[PDB]
UniProtKB/Swiss-Prot annotation:
Keywords tagged on the record: Copper, Disulfide bond, Glycoprotein, Membrane, Metal-binding, Methylation, Transmembrane, Transmembrane helix
Function in brief: Lytic polysaccharide monooxygenase-related protein that has no activity towards starch. Catalysis by LPMOs requires the reduction of the active-site copper from Cu(II) to Cu(I) by a reducing agent and H(2)O(2) or O(2) as a cosubstrate.
Annotated protein name in UniProt: Inactive AA13 family lytic polysaccharide monooxygenase
Record organism: Aspergillus oryzae (strain ATCC 42149 / RIB 40) (Yellow koji mold)
GO CC list: membrane
Subcellular localization: Membrane
Cofactors required: Cu(2+)
GO molecular function, one term: metal ion binding
Residues annotated as signal peptide: none
Membership in a protein family: Belongs to the polysaccharide monooxygenase AA13 family.
């Protein structure tokens, strides 16, 4: 259980607007989330998530999210990105952030009159995959391998970020990354912990595009997707 927190995602905004009672509940399951991190099709979840708790499809705007960029950045800017993990839902695993550089695809997610189809959700997800923002693009950022993966496996890569191991760390799982205090970010079920990294934005401009967060669970066959409306100018 978790969702993207900074920049403020559609999911965060949905919660803050009083629509989403459980922002961390937006889950793609059952899927094979491990060890091949892109194997699972995203279905109705799409790159922005679908929350079955309150039946919210975040792949289109509403009066409460998706109309405007929440934050504007510069081409090639190194930025903080943060997600929120629920205290009772720290499944470990790997996570990443992505920007689709095909505006015509992204535009289908920026119209409150229009709900992308499953085909369009998967087309966008593929575009997002191609626009992954690697951990290793940030000078000085230590980009480790997962303690739940071995060399040569499909999960053995440090373009994606990893949570800590469970048994193999004194700071276990995703919460151990920041080792933050409980309620450092909002979750409804048992209180949240921040999970914080940096990414380097592409040299790609848009007045309104998306950054899609994807977390592939290790302990469970589940993926958590959110997206944030941003500008790069
Ligand atoms: C987007 O905004 C900039 C100002 O930051 C403007 O000059 C540019 O032409 C706008 N783009 C489009 C496609 O209209
Ligand atoms: Zn969970
Ligand atoms: Zn709240
Ligand atoms: Zn994918
Ligand atoms: Zn794959
Ligand atoms: Zn700028
Ligand atoms: Zn506790
Ligand atoms: Zn296009
Ligand atoms: Zn394995
Ligand atoms: Zn483990």
């Amino acid at each position: 259980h978790g969702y993207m927190y900074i920049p403020s995602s559609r999911t965060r905004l949905g919660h803050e607007a009083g629509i989403d009672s459980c922002p961390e509940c937006a889950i793609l399951e059952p899927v094979s989330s491990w060890p091949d991190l892109d194997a699972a099709p995203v279905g109705r979840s799409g790159p922005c998530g679908y929350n079955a708790r309150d039946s919210i499809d975040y792949n289109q705007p509403t009066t409460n999210w998706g109309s405007d960029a929440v934050q504007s950045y510069s081409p090639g800017e190194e930025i903080e990105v943060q997600w929120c993990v629920d205290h009772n839902g720290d499944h470990g695993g790997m996570f990443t952030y992505r920007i689709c550089q095909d505006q015509s695809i992204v535009d289908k997610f920026l119209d409150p009159s229009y709900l992308p189809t499953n085909d369009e959700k998967q087309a966008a997800e593929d575009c997002f995959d191609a626009g992954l923002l690697p951990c290793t693009d940030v000078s000085g950022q230590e980009c480790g391998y997962s303690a739940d993966c071995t060399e040569g496996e499909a999960c053995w890569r440090n373009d994606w970020f990893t949570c800590n191991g469970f048994e193999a760390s004194d700071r276990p799982k995703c919460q151990g990354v920041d080792n933050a205090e409980l309620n450092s970010c909002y979750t409804s079920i048992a209180g949240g912990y921040t999970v914080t990294k940096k990414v380097k934005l592409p040299e790609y401009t848009s007045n309104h595009t998306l950054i899609s967060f994807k977390w592939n669970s290790f302990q469970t066959g589940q993926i958590y997707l959110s997206c944030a409306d941003i500008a790069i100018q």
